[PDB]
Design a protein around this motif. Structure first.
Motif, PDB file in Angstrom:
ATOM      1  N   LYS A  15       0.741  -1.844   0.027  1.00 34.02           N
ATOM      2  CA  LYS A  15      -0.439  -0.324  -0.098  1.00 34.02           C
ATOM      3  C   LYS A  15       0.560   1.427   0.219  1.00 34.02           C
ATOM      4  O   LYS A  15       0.416   1.632  -0.915  1.00 34.02           O
ATOM      5  N   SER A  16       1.777   1.337   1.004  1.00 33.64           N
ATOM      6  CA  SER A  16       2.677   2.705   1.269  1.00 33.64           C
ATOM      7  C   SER A  16       3.581   2.530  -0.401  1.00 33.64           C
ATOM      8  O   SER A  16       3.828   3.635  -0.888  1.00 33.64           O
ATOM      9  N   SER A  17       3.895   1.647  -0.860  1.00 35.78           N
ATOM     10  CA  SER A  17       4.447   1.439  -2.237  1.00 35.78           C
ATOM     11  C   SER A  17       4.367   1.486  -3.415  1.00 35.78           C
ATOM     12  O   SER A  17       4.478   3.009  -3.471  1.00 35.78           O
ATOM     13  N   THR A  33       7.345  -1.297   7.782  1.00 38.02           N
ATOM     14  CA  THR A  33       5.488  -1.693   7.806  1.00 38.02           C
ATOM     15  C   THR A  33       5.014   0.043   8.895  1.00 38.02           C
ATOM     16  O   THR A  33       5.753   0.855   9.655  1.00 38.02           O
ATOM     17  N   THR A  34       3.580   0.255   8.179  1.00 31.31           N
ATOM     18  CA  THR A  34       2.502   1.409   8.749  1.00 31.31           C
ATOM     19  C   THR A  34       2.695   1.599  10.106  1.00 31.31           C
ATOM     20  O   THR A  34       1.673   0.282  10.294  1.00 31.31           O
ATOM     21  N   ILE A  35       2.759   2.734  11.032  1.00 34.31           N
ATOM     22  CA  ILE A  35       2.390   2.339  12.199  1.00 34.31           C
ATOM     23  C   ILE A  35       0.942   3.184  12.072  1.00 34.31           C
ATOM     24  O   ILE A  35       0.159   2.806  12.568  1.00 34.31           O
ATOM     25  N   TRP A  56      -4.963   8.635   2.078  1.00 28.33           N
ATOM     26  CA  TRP A  56      -4.835   8.088   3.476  1.00 28.33           C
ATOM     27  C   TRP A  56      -3.820   6.312   3.188  1.00 28.33           C
ATOM     28  O   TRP A  56      -4.580   6.313   3.690  1.00 28.33           O
ATOM     29  N   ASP A  57      -3.017   6.730   3.645  1.00 29.45           N
ATOM     30  CA  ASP A  57      -2.510   5.247   3.432  1.00 29.45           C
ATOM     31  C   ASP A  57      -2.299   4.503   4.773  1.00 29.45           C
ATOM     32  O   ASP A  57      -1.641   5.056   5.568  1.00 29.45           O
ATOM     33  N   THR A  58      -3.332   3.392   5.200  1.00 28.65           N
ATOM     34  CA  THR A  58      -2.983   3.143   6.346  1.00 28.65           C
ATOM     35  C   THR A  58      -2.626   1.334   6.283  1.00 28.65           C
ATOM     36  O   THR A  58      -1.887   0.920   5.994  1.00 28.65           O
TER      37      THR A  58
HETATM   38 MG   LIG Z   1       2.450   0.788   4.515  1.00 33.92          MG
END
Ligand SMILES: [Mg+2]
Ligand SMILES: Nc1nc2c(ncn2[C@@H]2O[C@H](COP(=O)(O)OP(=O)(O)NP(=O)(O)O)[C@@H](O)[C@H]2O)c(=O)[nH]1
Length: 164
Positions: A15-17, A33-35, A56-58
């Motif tokens: 997702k973040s990438s 990893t997204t906190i 919004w990158d959850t």
């Molecule tokens: Mg992420």
């Protein structure tokens, strides 16, 4: 006018990438990893008229699932991401789609994205199988993409934008 989009899906799918590739042209082999959900922006032209994405990158880990409605409540669109190399992530994507249909605004546009297409032989989800989910769920679009290779990331966002 602006496109408020939420990224959802199993942790590790990318997702973040995807959102960092699209908004910042940044990819990291070791993306952390997204906190807490991250906010990312970019302006793109439509057919002449300008457009601002607010993304919004959850965090995808199940322990952060109960936070996801804070980010999906005002959304115009959702990108539900899975990893084409990990069959289990497609079922996770189906759970998110159902959750959105039950809990989010009925006008929400959902696009399914199978990421990591660059990992060739390690594919476990066919294009056919990913699209079967998108067709069954009457989603707005279905793409396979690669944040790493920057393949189809721009196209997913442009397609979604035209449907908002
Ligand atoms: Mg992420
Ligand atoms: N080969 C390949 N690796 C990818 C691709 N996109 C993401 N990755 C890798 O997969 C890992 C997880 O990516 P990341 O963007 O953090 O996933 P996420 O969905 O945001 N995880 P979380 O929900 O925990 O925040 C990272 O090592 C990243 O480099 C891609 O298209 N191809």
């Amino acid at each position: 006018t602006s496109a408020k989009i939420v990224m959802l899906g199993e942790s590790g799918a990318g997702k973040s990438s995807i959102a960092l590739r699209f908004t910042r042209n940044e990819f990291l082999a070791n993306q952390e990893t997204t906190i807490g959900a991250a906010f990312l922006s970019k302006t793109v032209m439509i057919d002449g008229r300008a457009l601002k994405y607010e993304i919004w990158d959850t965090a995808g880990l199940e322990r952060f699932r109960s936070l996801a409605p804070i980010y999906y409540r005002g959304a115009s669109g959702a990108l539900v991401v899975y990893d084409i190399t990990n069959s289990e992530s497609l079922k996770k994507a189906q759970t998110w789609i159902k959750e959105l249909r039950a809990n989010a605004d009925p006008s929400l546009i959902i696009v399914l994205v199978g990421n990591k297409k660059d990992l060739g032989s390690l594919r476990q989800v066919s294009f056919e199988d990913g699209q079967r989910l998108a067709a069954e769920e009457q989603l707005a679009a279905f793409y396979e993409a690669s944040a790493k290779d920057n393949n189809n990331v721009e196209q997913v966002f442009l397609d979604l934008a035209a449907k908002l």
